[PDB]
Design a protein around this ligand. Structure first.
Ligand SMILES: *[C@@H]1O[C@H](CO)[C@@H](O[C@@H]2O[C@H](CO)[C@@H](O)[C@H](O)[C@H]2NC(C)=O)[C@H](O)[C@H]1NC(C)=O
Ligand code: NAG
Ligand code: NAG
Ligand code: NAG
Ligand code: NAG
Ligand code: NAG
Ligand code: NAG
Ligand code: NAG
Ligand code: NAG
Lengths: 414, 112, 196
């Protein structure tokens, strides 16, 4: 229902925690050029000398892809070069943080949620398909995620722009409310309710991740499928008589075998060209996912964002990053007002003959009453001379009513 | 130099990257300099030689957390920083005739 | 970028010298060592090999152009956000707090120069979330209450500046029983001697 004289104001609010997943890197692979076309044959190298520039381009291109996974891993999990210790005392005002911070007695340095994500996560070398291992282990990555998680719980946002500064958590959350337009007294009046809502939403997340991940197994699926695709090409002919070079060499002198060897060479070289171009496109797609995740790391975690729907859904408060195989997991802590009530409203108020405009609030009315409240939450205040400012007369305002203003200087006259 | 192998299981130093020949393993860890893989970073320090060590994560510092104490900056600085970005690349054009065929008539006829 | 272009051109030039299975790479030697009806297979092999080289060169240049355009759009957004006005995004106009920025030209590119605002020294202090005067709670307008341990002040959240606590720096919104951590300390009203 839309009207020219009405407004509805939030009265309660709820907190909720939202998950989003993004891939960060992908399996590194290096494919020899000679071995794939030629096994242990000496004559198979000689016919390949004419195309030596193709082997040098194909070996250089997978190296240039190989360094990109190292830059993608090195740009998201490293916004600080200081490892912040984790305090022993665990009282943070009633906000129970026993799930995202890692328990010391655990033998691995993951916490509980990283293990749930680790359990959800799902000879080849003879043909020359080598897999190189990533530069960083999951324990050192988990050391970086533990430093980043500790820095928001200890220093707020002023540790990634400068040297760390301590601050209790009770003022950190009130600093986050004034950034979205809410007075801080709503935090100080209802801390136990939000703390138990935050603990219940963490338990809801533990139940939701345990019941999904459709964007972190596919990137492994594409590489494993494409590798089996290059495997099956070893048994194709291309209009040849056999699929094994030593069988051609064992049965027919080399001059009477060059017509089969060149026909196998062009086909296998063409399949290498296909595999290399497919890896270049997927690597560029990963580069795009990596730069976007690095911006979310430097935007949601450090500082607070003024962009609607950049971190979660709702008015963003905090984030808590986690680490899982080949990808990051963000945990946004949004704020969503709940109950509302319809009310009569007015742009301005005339009293003395001067238009009284509200400072930071909006004028509301209950019929018998006239109050002012903050835009994003209900709290009724009487009209005073410290809550409005005067400007001009009352004839230029289309919608104005009459109501008396109490001067707080009346007892000052007594 | 220090020759490193990838899948070869053998100053021999055996790692998860392969077999490492010609570097003296030490227990003193440093900031990474030359990355090899699996957490191994080599350097040329002390005599000085090609040494092998496990990388050192960031730098340690103590954190101070109280339930009633705050810290307020009292001095500030001004500095400048740089960021380099490429905006364009060289424009090139290549003719489909001259490259494929030099001077010849049937080389043009075959390309119809 | 110059290195990548000079390699991509040099490989095109080097591929002219390979026969790709032929008995010579010189077209005039093909036309002199066979009749054209029998030299068409050598000409077709050179045609197929040079077309494969040109195909790879073109695909490589299409690939590089898309990344260069992505970097140009990123520099454009730094041009309209770092140079003009301030941003509130941290780690997107250089380390720490950013004031203004200064574009400088460079061959195939641009160099930005930020002026960063960084705190340095600090001092330890005993805080309080809120202060109970006479039944009412006094929350600071935008400050945070600090105290050396013998005097109580209020200041901004990023720079030291002691100021005497006053009724014009706090607003009341209830009582003291709903707030844990509140201390007992009186508040000065500057208007009382003004009434005398
Ligand atoms: C706003 O919503 C919260 C959460 O529902 C309310 O908190 C509950 O209040 C009732 C009061 O009887 C308690 O029994 C519950 O335990 C509280 N929390 C839960 C888990 O629901 C709060 O009272 C609501 N406030 C308003 C203004 O209605
Ligand atoms: C936090 O929750 C866990 C799991 O229920 C519990 O074992 C722990 O004691 C709780 N800690 C606090 C501070 O209540
Ligand atoms: C708004 O509240 C008034 C006062 O109770 C009531 O008369 C009216 O029906 C309400 N309007 C809506 C939108 O329900
Ligand atoms: C608001 O709408 C009502 C019903 O159409 C109308 O009578 C009244 O004049 C309107 N007031 C303004 C300020 O437009
Ligand atoms: C406010 O009071 C003036 C003077 O009596 C009157 O002319 C005007 O119509 C009133 N407006 C209302 C009813 O809000
Ligand atoms: C290397 O070989 C030795 C002897 O067979 C064996 O004990 C060891 O486990 C092997 N290590 C690896 C990395 O395979
Ligand atoms: C810190 O600030 C004070 C007062 O402005 C000044 O005297 C002192 O030289 C400054 N120290 C530094 C680190 O520049
Ligand atoms: C800090 O914690 C200690 C131990 O629980 C407690 O005695 C003290 O009152 C707390 N202080 C504040 C202001 O929270
Ligand atoms: C503060 O003063 C009130 C009233 O005298 C008293 O009841 C309360 O215990 C005092 N609290 C402290 C912290 O001294």
């Amino acid at each position: 229902a839309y009207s020219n004289n009405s407004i509805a104001i939030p009265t309660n609010f709820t907190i909720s925690v939202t998950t989003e997943i993004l891939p960060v890197s992908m399996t590194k692979t290096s494919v020899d050029c000679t071995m794939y076309i030629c096994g242990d044959s000496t004559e198979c190298s000689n016919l390949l000398l004419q195309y030596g520039s193709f082997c040098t381009q194909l070996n250089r291109a997978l190296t240039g892809i190989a360094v990109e996974q190292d830059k993608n891993t090195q740009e998201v999990f490293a916004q600080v070069k200081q490892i912040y210790k984790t305090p022993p005392i665990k009282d943070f005002g009633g906000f129970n943080f026993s799930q995202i911070l890692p328990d010391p007695s655990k033998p691995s340095k993951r916490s509980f949620i990283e293990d749930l994500l680790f359990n959800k996560v799902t000879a080849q070398k003879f043909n020359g398909l080598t897999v190189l291992p990533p530069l960083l282990t999951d324990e050192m990555i988990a050391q970086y995620t533990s430093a980043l998680l500790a820095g928001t719980i200890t220093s707020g946002w002023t540790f990634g722009a400068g040297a760390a500064l301590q601050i209790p958590f009770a003022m950190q959350m009130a600093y986050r409310f004034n950034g979205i337009g809410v007075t801080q007294n709503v935090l100080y009046e209802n801390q136990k309710l939000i703390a138990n809502q935050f603990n219940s939403a963490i338990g809801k997340i533990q139940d939701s991740l345990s019941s999904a991940l459709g964007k972190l197994q596919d990137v492994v699926n594409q590489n494993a499928q494409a590798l089996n695709t290059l495997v099956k090409q070893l048994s194709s002919n291309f209009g040849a008589i056999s699929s094994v070079l030593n069988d051609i060499l064992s049965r027919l002198d080399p001059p009477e075998a060059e017509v089969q060897i060149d026909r196998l060479i062009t086909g296998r070289l063409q399949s290498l060209q296909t595999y290399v171009t497919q890896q270049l496109i997927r690597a560029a797609e990963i580069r795009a996912s990596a730069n976007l995740a690095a911006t979310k790391m430097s935007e949601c975690v450090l500082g607070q964002s003024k962009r609607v729907d950049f971190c979660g859904k709702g008015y963003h408060l905090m984030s808590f990053p986690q680490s899982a195989p080949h990808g990051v997991v963000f945990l946004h802590v949004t704020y969503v007002p709940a109950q509302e009530k319809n009310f009569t409203t007015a742009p301005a108020i005339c009293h003395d003959g001067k238009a009284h405009f509200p400072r930071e609030g909006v004028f509301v009315s209950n019929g018998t009453h006239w109050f002012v409240t903050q835009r994003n939450f209900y709290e009724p205040q009487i009209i005073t001379t410290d809550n409005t400012f005067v400007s001009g007369n009352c004839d230029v305002v289309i919608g104005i009513v009459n109501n008396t203003v109490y001067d707080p200087l009346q007892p000052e006259l007594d | 130099v220090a020759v490193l192998y990838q899948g070869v299981n053998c100053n021999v130093f055996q790692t998860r990257a392969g077999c490492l020949i010609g570097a003296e393993h030490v227990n003193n860890s440093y900031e990474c300099d030359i990355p090899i893989g699996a957490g191994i970073c080599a350097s040329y320090q002390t005599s000085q030689s090609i040494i092998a060590y496990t990388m050192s994560l960031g730098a340690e510092n103590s954190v101070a957390y109280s339930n009633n104490s705050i810290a307020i900056p009292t001095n500030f600085t001004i500095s400048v920083t740089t960021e380099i970005l490429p905006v364009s690349m060289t424009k090139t054009s290549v003719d489909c005739t001259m490259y494929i065929c030099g001077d010849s008539t049937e080389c043009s006829n075959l390309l119809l």
